[PDB]
């Protein structure tokens, strides 16, 4: 009982916990996007400013 | 020697991962009445059959 | 030019807001602990999940 209890345990822990190391991995690669993308938004809005003239 | 060899059916019979039996003979090569593959590829035909053996009394 | 509507600001606004969606989604992976939080994540393999932890208590 104990003993299939630690491998019923480990197949549940594979699917259902977190790989943290690589969720570290996509959570900076997505916040990164989201600095990059809010640069290129704000330069967006001050493109149009130039034909006033 | 009478409860061990009753125990060593009880296992067999109630050997369960994810509510499917292991060794009481479904997955056997001679007869039998399911076949374990993994899909260990990312094609159609990358699968490996897996065989286990009646292990009861 | 056109000054009435910015077409690469709408790109630039409809690209960020998806980032800011993963961006949520990993935050709950990564505070909750678990790969799966809410259904439809995997949904074959929350069922899975469930099942296994009726198993293991």
Redesign the interface.
């Known amino acids: 009982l104990m003993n299939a209890?630690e491998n019923?345990?480990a197949?549940?822990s594979r699917?259902?916990?977190?790989?943290?190391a690589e969720?570290?991995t996509?959570?900076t690669r997505?916040?990164i996007?989201?600095q990059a993308?809010?640069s290129?938004?704000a330069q967006?809005?001050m493109?149009?400013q130039?034909?006033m003239r | 020697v009478s409860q061990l060899v009753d125990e060593i059916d009880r296992i067999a019979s109630q050997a369960?991962f994810?509510?499917m039996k292991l060794l009481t003979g479904a997955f056997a090569r001679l007869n039998p009445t399911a076949s374990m593959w993994f899909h260990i590829g990312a094609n159609m035909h990358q699968r490996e059959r897996v065989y286990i053996e009646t292990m009861n009394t | 030019?056109i000054?009435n509507h910015?077409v690469?600001?709408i790109f630039?606004?409809r690209?960020?807001k998806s980032?800011?969606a993963?961006?949520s989604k990993?935050?709950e992976?990564?505070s909750s602990?678990?790969?799966?939080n809410k259904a439809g994540d995997?949904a074959s393999?929350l069922a899975?999940?469930e099942?296994?932890?009726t198993?293991?208590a």
């Not at chain 1, 699917?15 to 943290?20: A, F, N, S, V, Y």
């Not at chain 3, 602990?33 to 799966?36: A, K, P, S, T």
């Open positions: 209890y019923t345990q197949s549940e699917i259902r916990d977190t790989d943290m969720q570290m996509s959570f997505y916040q996007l989201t993308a809010t290129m938004l967006a809005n493109k149009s130039s034909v | 369960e994810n509510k | 030019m000054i910015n690469s600001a630039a606004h690209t960020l980032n800011d993963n961006l990993d935050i992976k990564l602990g678990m790969r799966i995997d393999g899975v999940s099942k296994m932890r198993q293991i």
